[PDB]
Amino acid sequence: RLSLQNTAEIQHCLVNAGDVGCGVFECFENNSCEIRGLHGICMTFLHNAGKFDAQGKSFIKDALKCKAHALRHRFGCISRKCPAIREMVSQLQRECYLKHDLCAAAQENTRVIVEMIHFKDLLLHEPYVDLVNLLLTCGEEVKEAITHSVQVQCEQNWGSLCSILSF
Amino acid sequence: SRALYFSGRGEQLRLRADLELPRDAFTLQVWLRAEGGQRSPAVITGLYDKCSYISRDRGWVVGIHTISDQDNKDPRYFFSLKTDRARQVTTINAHRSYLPGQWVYLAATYDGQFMKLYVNGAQVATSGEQVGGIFSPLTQKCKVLMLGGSALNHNYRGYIEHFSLWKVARTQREILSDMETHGAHTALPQLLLQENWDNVKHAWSPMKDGSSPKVEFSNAHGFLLDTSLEPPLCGQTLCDNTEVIASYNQLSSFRQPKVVRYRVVNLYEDDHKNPTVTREQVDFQHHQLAEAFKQYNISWELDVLEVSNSSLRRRLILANCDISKIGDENCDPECNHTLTGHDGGDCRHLRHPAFVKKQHNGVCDMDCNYERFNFDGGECCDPEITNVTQTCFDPDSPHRAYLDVNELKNILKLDGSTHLNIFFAKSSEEELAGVATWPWDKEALMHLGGIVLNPSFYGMPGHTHTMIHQIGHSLGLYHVFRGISEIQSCSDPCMETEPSFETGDLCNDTNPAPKHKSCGDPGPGNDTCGFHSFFNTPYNNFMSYADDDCTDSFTPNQVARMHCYLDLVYQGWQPSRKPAPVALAPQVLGHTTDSVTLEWFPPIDGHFFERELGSACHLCLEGRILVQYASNASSPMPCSPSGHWSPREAEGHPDVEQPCKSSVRTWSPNSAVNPHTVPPACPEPQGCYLELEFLYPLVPESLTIWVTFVSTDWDSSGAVNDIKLLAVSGKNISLGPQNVFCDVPLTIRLWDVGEEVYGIQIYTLDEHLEIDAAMLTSTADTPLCLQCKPLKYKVVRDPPLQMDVASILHLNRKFVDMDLNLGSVYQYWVITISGTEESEPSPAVTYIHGSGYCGDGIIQKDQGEQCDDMNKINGDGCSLFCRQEVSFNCIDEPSRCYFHDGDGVCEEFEQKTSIKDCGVY
Amino acid sequence: PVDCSIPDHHQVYAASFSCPEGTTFGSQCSFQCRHPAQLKGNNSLLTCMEDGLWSFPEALCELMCLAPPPVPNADLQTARCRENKHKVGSFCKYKCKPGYHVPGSSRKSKKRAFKTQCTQDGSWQEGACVPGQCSVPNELNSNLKLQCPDGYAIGSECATSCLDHNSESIILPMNVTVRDIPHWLNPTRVERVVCTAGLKWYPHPALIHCVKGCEPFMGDNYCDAINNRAFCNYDGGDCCTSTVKTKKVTPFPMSCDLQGDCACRDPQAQEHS
Ligand SMILES: *[C@@H]1O[C@H](CO)[C@@H](O)[C@H](O)[C@H]1NC(C)=O
Ligand SMILES: *[C@@H]1O[C@H](CO)[C@@H](O)[C@H](O)[C@H]1NC(C)=O
Ligand SMILES: *[C@@H]1O[C@H](CO)[C@@H](O)[C@H](O)[C@H]1NC(C)=O
Ligand SMILES: *[C@@H]1O[C@H](CO)[C@@H](O)[C@H](O)[C@H]1NC(C)=O
Ligand SMILES: *[C@@H]1O[C@H](CO)[C@@H](O)[C@H](O)[C@H]1NC(C)=O
Ligand SMILES: *[C@@H]1O[C@H](CO)[C@@H](O)[C@H](O)[C@H]1NC(C)=O
Ligand SMILES: *[C@@H]1O[C@H](CO)[C@@H](O)[C@H](O)[C@H]1NC(C)=O
Ligand SMILES: *[C@@H]1O[C@H](CO)[C@@H](O)[C@H](O)[C@H]1NC(C)=O
Ligand SMILES: [Ca+2]
Ligand SMILES: [Ca+2]
Ligand SMILES: [Ca+2]
Ligand SMILES: [Ca+2]
Ligand SMILES: [Ca+2]
Ligand SMILES: [Ca+2]
Ligand SMILES: [Ca+2]
Ligand SMILES: [Ca+2]
Ligand SMILES: [Zn+2]
């Protein structure tokens, strides 16, 4: 259900916005298919990139580049219907992060990734959900760390409801 | 006489410093044939200062640049000048966008207080801002006169012939005299330069980089009796012209009986049962058609076509519906229908979440057959599970239950060039029963054109005059309520305020009427604008929306339109082999003490050669040059390996109503995709390409491409990255990037191509560029046009020619009468002989030898001459028929016409209309 | 009366105008050619004419270059250049004296001759003519390591390595320590050390400190502060707009100040020109 005018403006965005940084993700936001969070992933990663180590700075150099470039191409003749777009974005996350070894970089900066991930931001944006899911299969120690943080944040924000859902 | 061709790639000339350039006053005079798609700006010639390190704008420049610089759209001739003493540069322009491929006498003068620009001798611009001399004698060595472009690569592409430069300003009579000499050479004291290009190196040295333009033999300076007759503002073809249509109106010999064949497409089941229309329908409708058309000299020959195809018969044929609009989640009532899934579900909402269980069931039911449920995943479109003809509602499955008439027309591939095809559909609208192709479309004679009707409204008592309405549409008749209900707005420039030949339905005898269904006179307040009430409306005319019980007649002007279009376009339908007549009376060129010269127009259909079936000569023009449009068209399917595809909108003659606006009648890379799919970007630097093939491969001479729309942003590549000529032997000559204008057809000359070219490939990096059509013009005496015989004209005079002339026949459309007596009245008409069958006589011209006429240079006001310029060319202000053109005022005798709407001087008759000069009234 | 207005530089180029009588019809403003432009003609008065535009000048301020200055250690080759009459664009050839060569000449071909041009402002374009064993390195930096495959014999070369693989062993100027490095200073890279005949290491290990080498992020369109220094290509031109390929500056991380460390520090940028 991607609006035709919305599609036109996004298409003109991509050919103009540069690869580096996240000018690309900027106006892929506000899309008619409600897909939000790519630009948030950019800002979260870029702001917290100062806390990453040498390997982490490499990962942020090249994973953001993969997603920018791939969203400039996979947004080719993909179906105008929303479910196809959500799948295209999801596959961007999986392929870009896995190709660039998300697991080991996250293992080097577990304490950082825990700070970056927010329970609130997790619910608002689907790309965040794919990010945390890929982290869960990136080492038992890291997955344990993520579980600790997510339950405490959910418990504070939801009160007894979080404990009810956390069987 | 020789002419320079500037290829636009860097060939420039520079006048040698031996000549004393003019300081105080000057006059440039150059014949030129500019091509389409120039670089903006394109300096034809200019005076430049080579010493001014800071202000290069000093000096003057004559060239072609776009008015409305934002979205370069309107390329006009221009004259810029900045004297050494002035503060700003001053630019004046022509009245209209230049015409590519036409010889134009561009003359520009400056007398020291008034700079003026003349196009074909009619003063089109004037400015008094620049005062004083151009440059002081001290700076005389610092001025260089350069032709073909500036040193800044403001290059010009096209022909330049007989450059001339005076050191005085020439009044309009002097420039007109110099134009009529047509390159004749003579030395005058005020002549600095006169160039016949016999020796370019003698006077002009090429600019640096050593690229000099080529020197051809000029085909001609011009042609007497300009035969180019443009239709009016509303009109579309030569039959909308007031002069042409007057001949069909006044004369009764132009409406002789004509038999026109029409074919009825009757679909059938495989067992030859269940007709789409019963034989009673065809017989009854044919009888009613014959009765209505009997009195108007049109009789229809009935051919019935039985197609026994259940796979076509059982499906629902749709009219006015577009398959792309089904399932787009936007409600489309015209594609509503039971077998289309109510627009594929766009127009049918319900408690959808209550149907999740029915998914994955493996059996078709009803609720899952929609686009948001994805049509049950193809269970319903499977012939094995269920029954497609009532279950396969999807617009993508080839087994869908509905077609549209465009696909039905594609399937049948009927010969539309010899019959009027009557297809049958299901018109959902209560307004019309179908769509009839206009005579001025591509498909008028192709397999995709004809008439689509509703079988429920065909041959039924009370519904028979819907086919006669549609037939009138297919013969060029507009709706009588055009101009009020079919106008764009109340400010439409040719809305029919009063009965006229140039507004509305282009039929005077049909009063303005609104879109009204009852055949009483419309009531007060039934007007969209409400400016005037309607009286004596043609409520009973076939072209009105009244019921079949009251519509009974065509007005005599509408009958004239139908017969004009039966000679212009539909010569193929009629079995009669009478060639089309000459529409206009033989014009009088000039008279001597003992003779008179007559030149007449070609026959109205426009063909100069005898019509032979199967030959290519119906495309040949005078001089045996073959001009053809893109027949094939193919362009790779985007984001698909191979894909092939076939963009039929870029075939045939150009059909875009309004250039520079996005249209559906073009090839656009974005249009190549499924509308339910994000359009890709054109591949990097090769571009999306459109292949156009031409029916008759031949040695090309010039290529014309109608680039209707261009996105406005990038550079000067013109969005046409490359053009390749597919040679027959297998080569492919690349022509390099071309500059295009959105409203001027990109013209290219192919003098370098020596091999037979069968097609082109228009590459583009633009995802929004739109190509309307192409055109190949052959060289003179092309092989295919040699054998076919030419049309021959026979001239008949009243009184008859004294010697027993057999008319000696004719081929040149020029007759010199030697036998004349002073003061005697003579009448002339021409009869077109195509083999041995003579056409109807052309309208007569009455020339009284020794007296005046139209085109003698004397304004005989009694004859009706509003102007007279001793000349038979339109566009010089005074029309061919001795009538002032719009926005041109003509003074003196013979007439000197000038463009007054913005000549820098307000006048008496300009006060009420011209705000540019006289201000707000 | 019609106003010709104060005459601008457009009436006569490279001159100043005095208008004692004003700028009205019939006025006459006298022009003087500014140095070094020389007046050529017989009148220098511009009349304000009836059309509203200053009259034509009867004379012009010709631009010219006087005798070029004698370039040190160079001999003029063009005799005509010895005059005091050279128009704009005139070339003068100089030949360096023996034992001298033009700076910027390649080693394979030392050009002993050059040319200069009379530039538009009346000056001349510049041109010149340019003519046992060794002690164990006990005093070493913690991050610095020395590898000696050939022992410590006089003349043996020991490789200087750093604990950080992205750190370079260098020697800074005496006025600049490890943390005192300015943006404009490019330290001397040191790779090997040689013990001389004086029983001493040269350069001394105590003078070598492992300074953080820049990360491989050079030339990735990401202006990062660490690589933004003269030691390595100012982050490969990422931090300066003209040098970067994308023509836009996106500092990494975002928090880096565009007016601070991530500011364009390369002095060869067009913004610095
Ligand atoms: C029909 O044709 C006859 C000649 O056969 C002519 O006299 C008459 O004017 C024509 N009428 C119309 C309406 O075309
Ligand atoms: C009928 O036309 C269709 C095209 O729509 C074609 O596939 C088929 O072979 C034709 N004949 C029959 C008997 O269906
Ligand atoms: C389609 O037809 C159905 C049934 O006639 C109707 O309810 C629906 O409004 C129609 N869709 C349109 C008008 O687009
Ligand atoms: C499809 O329709 C035909 C009509 O004759 C009928 O014979 C056949 O049984 C139907 N098949 C299904 C699966 O409905
Ligand atoms: C046009 O029609 C009007 C009546 O509406 C009539 O008076 C006039 O003579 C007609 N003129 C022509 C040229 O047919
Ligand atoms: C049209 O051109 C395409 C591509 O060159 C070709 O495959 C096809 O056969 C052509 N068709 C005709 C009718 O010439
Ligand atoms: C065009 O010509 C070039 C050689 O100039 C050749 O490589 C190419 O295959 C030809 N065809 C096209 C479509 O480019
Ligand atoms: C130049 O000016 C002088 C006065 O200063 C006058 O005597 C002489 O005639 C002038 N010469 C020319 C060539 O005008
Ligand atoms: Ca729809
Ligand atoms: Ca179903
Ligand atoms: Ca009318
Ligand atoms: Ca077209
Ligand atoms: Ca006359
Ligand atoms: Ca004329
Ligand atoms: Ca005027
Ligand atoms: Ca960097
Ligand atoms: Zn109609």
Numbering used by the authors:
A (entry chain P): 44 to 210
B (entry chain C): 94 to 1014
C (entry chain Q): 1282 to 1412, 1476 to 1617
Question: What did the paper state?
Answer:
Although first discovered as a placental antigen present in the circulation during human pregnancy, the metzincin metalloproteinase PAPP-A (pregnancy-associated plasma protein-A, pappalysin-1, EC 3.4.24.79) is ubiquitously expressed in human tissues. PAPP-A is able to cleave insulin-like growth factor binding proteins (IGFBP) -2, -4, and -5 in the extracellular environment. It consequently causes the release of bound bioactive IGF-1 or -2, which are potent growth factors. The paralogue proteins stanniocalcin (STC)-1 and -2 were recently identified as potent endogenous PAPP-A inhibitors and thus connected with the IGF system.
We have determined the structure of the metalloproteinase, PAPP-A, in complex with its endogenous inhibitor, STC2, to a resolution of 3.1 Å. The highest resolution (3.1 Å) was obtained for the STC2 subunit and the N-terminal approximately 1000 residues of the PAPP-A subunit. Some regions, in particular some of the SCR domains (4–7 Å) and M5-M6 (5–8 Å), were determined to a lower resolution, and will benefit from further structural analysis. (3) C120 of STC2, which is required for the function of STC2 in vivo, connects specifically to C732 of the M2 domain of PAPP-A, thus preventing dissociation of the complex. (2) Structural and biochemical data show that STC2 binds to the PAPP-A C domain, and that removal of Ca2+ from LNR3 diminishes its binding. While the core of the CD is similar in structure to other metzincins, in particular the two known unicellular pappalysin structures, the PAPP-A CD stands out in several regards, most notable by the inserted LNR modules. In PAPP-A, the LNR modules do not appear to have a similar role, but rather interact with either substrate or inhibitor. The pappalysin S1′ specificity pocket has a conserved aspartate in its bottom (D641 of PAPP-A)13,39 to accommodate the basic side chain of the substrate residue on the C-terminal side of the scissile bond, the P1′ position. Thus, the C612-C643 disulfide bond, which connects the ZnM loop (V573-F635) underneath the active site cleft to the CD core, may be important for keeping D641 in a position to provide specificity. Although the inhibited complex cannot cleave IGFBP-4, the PAPP-A active site is accessible and active toward a synthetic peptide derived from IGFBP-4.
